[PDB]
Amino acid sequence: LAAWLAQAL
């Protein structure tokens, strides 16, 4: 969850 969204940046 957290790890996936962070990659967008």
Side-chain angles (χ1 to χ4, degrees):
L1 181 63
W4 168 59
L5 292 176
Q7 297 168 330
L9 293 175

PDB file of all heavy atoms in Angstrom, unseen atoms left out:
ATOM      1  N   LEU A   1       0.839  -1.177   0.000  1.00  0.00           N
ATOM      2  CA  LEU A   1       0.000   0.000   0.000  1.00  0.00           C
ATOM      3  C   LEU A   1       0.893   1.253   0.000  1.00  0.00           C
ATOM      4  O   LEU A   1       1.109   1.873  -1.053  1.00  0.00           O
ATOM      5  CB  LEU A   1      -0.947  -0.041   1.200  1.00  0.00           C
ATOM      6  CG  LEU A   1      -1.921   1.113   1.343  1.00  0.00           C
ATOM      7  CD1 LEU A   1      -2.874   1.165   0.167  1.00  0.00           C
ATOM      8  CD2 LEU A   1      -2.692   0.972   2.632  1.00  0.00           C
ATOM      9  N   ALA A   2       1.447   1.594   1.162  1.00  0.00           N
ATOM     10  CA  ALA A   2       2.319   2.753   1.294  1.00  0.00           C
ATOM     11  C   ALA A   2       3.452   2.724   0.239  1.00  0.00           C
ATOM     12  O   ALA A   2       3.782   3.712  -0.426  1.00  0.00           O
ATOM     13  N   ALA A   3       4.042   1.537   0.093  1.00  0.00           N
ATOM     14  CA  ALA A   3       5.225   1.380  -0.746  1.00  0.00           C
ATOM     15  C   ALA A   3       4.905   1.623  -2.214  1.00  0.00           C
ATOM     16  O   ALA A   3       5.747   2.126  -2.963  1.00  0.00           O
ATOM     17  CB  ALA A   3       5.810   0.005  -0.573  1.00  0.00           C
ATOM     18  N   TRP A   4       3.706   1.215  -2.624  1.00  0.00           N
ATOM     19  CA  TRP A   4       3.265   1.393  -4.001  1.00  0.00           C
ATOM     20  C   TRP A   4       3.015   2.866  -4.301  1.00  0.00           C
ATOM     21  O   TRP A   4       3.522   3.412  -5.294  1.00  0.00           O
ATOM     22  CB  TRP A   4       2.003   0.555  -4.213  1.00  0.00           C
ATOM     23  CG  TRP A   4       1.263   0.838  -5.486  1.00  0.00           C
ATOM     24  CD1 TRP A   4       1.742   0.723  -6.759  1.00  0.00           C
ATOM     25  CD2 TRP A   4      -0.098   1.271  -5.609  1.00  0.00           C
ATOM     26  NE1 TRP A   4       0.765   1.050  -7.662  1.00  0.00           N
ATOM     27  CE2 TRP A   4      -0.370   1.408  -6.987  1.00  0.00           C
ATOM     28  CE3 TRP A   4      -1.113   1.550  -4.689  1.00  0.00           C
ATOM     29  CZ2 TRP A   4      -1.610   1.812  -7.466  1.00  0.00           C
ATOM     30  CZ3 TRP A   4      -2.342   1.948  -5.164  1.00  0.00           C
ATOM     31  CH2 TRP A   4      -2.583   2.080  -6.543  1.00  0.00           C
ATOM     32  N   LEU A   5       2.245   3.534  -3.453  1.00  0.00           N
ATOM     33  CA  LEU A   5       1.943   4.935  -3.707  1.00  0.00           C
ATOM     34  C   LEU A   5       3.211   5.785  -3.751  1.00  0.00           C
ATOM     35  O   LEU A   5       3.337   6.668  -4.613  1.00  0.00           O
ATOM     36  CB  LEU A   5       0.946   5.473  -2.680  1.00  0.00           C
ATOM     37  CG  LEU A   5      -0.456   4.876  -2.783  1.00  0.00           C
ATOM     38  CD1 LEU A   5      -1.318   5.416  -1.664  1.00  0.00           C
ATOM     39  CD2 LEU A   5      -1.104   5.172  -4.123  1.00  0.00           C
ATOM     40  N   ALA A   6       4.144   5.536  -2.835  1.00  0.00           N
ATOM     41  CA  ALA A   6       5.349   6.322  -2.771  1.00  0.00           C
ATOM     42  C   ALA A   6       6.105   6.357  -4.117  1.00  0.00           C
ATOM     43  O   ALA A   6       6.745   7.349  -4.497  1.00  0.00           O
ATOM     44  N   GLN A   7       6.048   5.238  -4.844  1.00  0.00           N
ATOM     45  CA  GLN A   7       6.811   5.130  -6.087  1.00  0.00           C
ATOM     46  C   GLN A   7       6.339   6.115  -7.148  1.00  0.00           C
ATOM     47  O   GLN A   7       7.107   6.448  -8.062  1.00  0.00           O
ATOM     48  CB  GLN A   7       6.757   3.708  -6.668  1.00  0.00           C
ATOM     49  CG  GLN A   7       7.373   2.623  -5.801  1.00  0.00           C
ATOM     50  CD  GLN A   7       7.025   1.221  -6.289  1.00  0.00           C
ATOM     51  OE1 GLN A   7       5.961   0.993  -6.869  1.00  0.00           O
ATOM     52  NE2 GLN A   7       7.917   0.269  -6.035  1.00  0.00           N
ATOM     53  N   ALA A   8       5.098   6.581  -7.040  1.00  0.00           N
ATOM     54  CA  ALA A   8       4.578   7.541  -7.980  1.00  0.00           C
ATOM     55  C   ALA A   8       5.420   8.826  -8.030  1.00  0.00           C
ATOM     56  O   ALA A   8       5.469   9.529  -9.043  1.00  0.00           O
ATOM     57  N   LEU A   9       6.072   9.127  -6.899  1.00  0.00           N
ATOM     58  CA  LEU A   9       6.910  10.325  -6.770  1.00  0.00           C
ATOM     59  C   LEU A   9       8.351  10.082  -7.182  1.00  0.00           C
ATOM     60  O   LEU A   9       9.246  10.888  -6.974  1.00  0.00           O
ATOM     61  CB  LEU A   9       6.871  10.850  -5.341  1.00  0.00           C
ATOM     62  CG  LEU A   9       5.525  11.413  -4.895  1.00  0.00           C
ATOM     63  CD1 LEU A   9       5.585  11.801  -3.414  1.00  0.00           C
ATOM     64  CD2 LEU A   9       5.107  12.602  -5.739  1.00  0.00           C
TER      65      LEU A   9
END
